[PDB]
Every structure is written in structure tokens, then in C-alpha cells.
From Swiss-Prot:
The chain holds residues 1 to 73 of 148 of the full protein. Belongs to the bacterial ribosomal protein bL9 family. This is Large ribosomal subunit protein bL9. Binds to the 23S rRNA. The gene is rplI. It comes from Thermus thermophilus (strain ATCC BAA-163 / DSM 7039 / HB27). Coiled coil: none annotated.
Length: 73
RNA sequence: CCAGCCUAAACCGUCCGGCUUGUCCGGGCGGGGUCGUGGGGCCCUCGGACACCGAAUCCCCAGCCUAGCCGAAGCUGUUGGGA
């Protein structure tokens, strides 16, 4: 089974990672304890919009950084 | 006997709800779409259109069913209880 976890559980990996576990761990512990949410296609898309979000934003501000980099220098 | 159609899905607007407010997930609605020479979506170009196509839907009517009316032409005698 696949899932997207919301807590760095010293068993699988840090949050966000989309790690595999058997139905049980995720059907009767990890889902109800909201430790991780179920991994449908829908959600994997939610992932990208977020990553890219700050990806470009960190590069974009970065760009603006160089602007001041030159005029201040 | 005759007959073919609408949709789910990619996408866009919108309202609302959620939440690690995202250039987003979902739910409702609308737009979009319905195919086997495969189709649809998205961008570009063509002119994109007055045109075509047209209901199993709707209104009017005929006809029609539910009571009915017109409807031609004969008399005499004879048997017989009675023609």
C-alpha cells in the first residue's frame, strides 16, 4: 500500500515521503491515527503544486536577490 | 418494423466547504464532450457565418371513441284460432 505521511515516523521516513506499508499499518493504525493519509492519485498532485510553489519562489526571490546583489555591491 | 440518443472523463467560470492559504484538493452547478474514416480537449491558422439538420418535446387541427338520427317498396281475395 502507498501513503503520504504527516510526521517523521522513525519507521518509514520523514513527512511527505510517499512510502509503502501493508494495508493494516495504514488501514487500522496509520489512517485513523491520521499519522499518514491514504495515497490516491488526487493527492500526489497536491504534492507537486506545493513543491514547485516554493521551488520557483525560492529561485525567483533568489533572482531578485542578485538584483540587489549588483546595485549594492 | 425502422431509430436513434444523452452522458463519465481531459478542460474553463462560478459558489461553498476544508486546510500543512496553494498558481490547490474537493463538492454542487454551468460551459465544454460523446467516437472506430477513432474521438475530444489545448494553441495557431481558415471567413467564421447568414445557411443547413431537426425531435421520442410542445401547441392547433383533421380524423377518431364515448349518446344517436334519415333510411326505399303492397294492396285484394282464399285456407286457418291466427297468414
Amino acid at each position: 500500500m502507498k501513503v503520504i505521511l504527516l510526521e517523521p515516523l522513525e519507521n518509514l521516513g520523514d513527512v511527505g515521503q510517499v512510502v509503502d506499508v501493508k494495508p493494516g499499518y495504514a488501514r487500522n493504525y496509520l489512517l485513523p491515527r491520521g499519522l499518514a493519509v491514504l495515497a490516491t492519485e488526487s493527492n500526489l498532485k497536491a504534492l507537486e503544486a506545493r513543491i514547485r510553489a516554493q521551488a520557483k519562489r525560492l529561485a525567483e526571490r533568489k533572482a531578485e536577490a542578485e538584483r540587489l546583489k549588483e546595485i549594492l555591491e
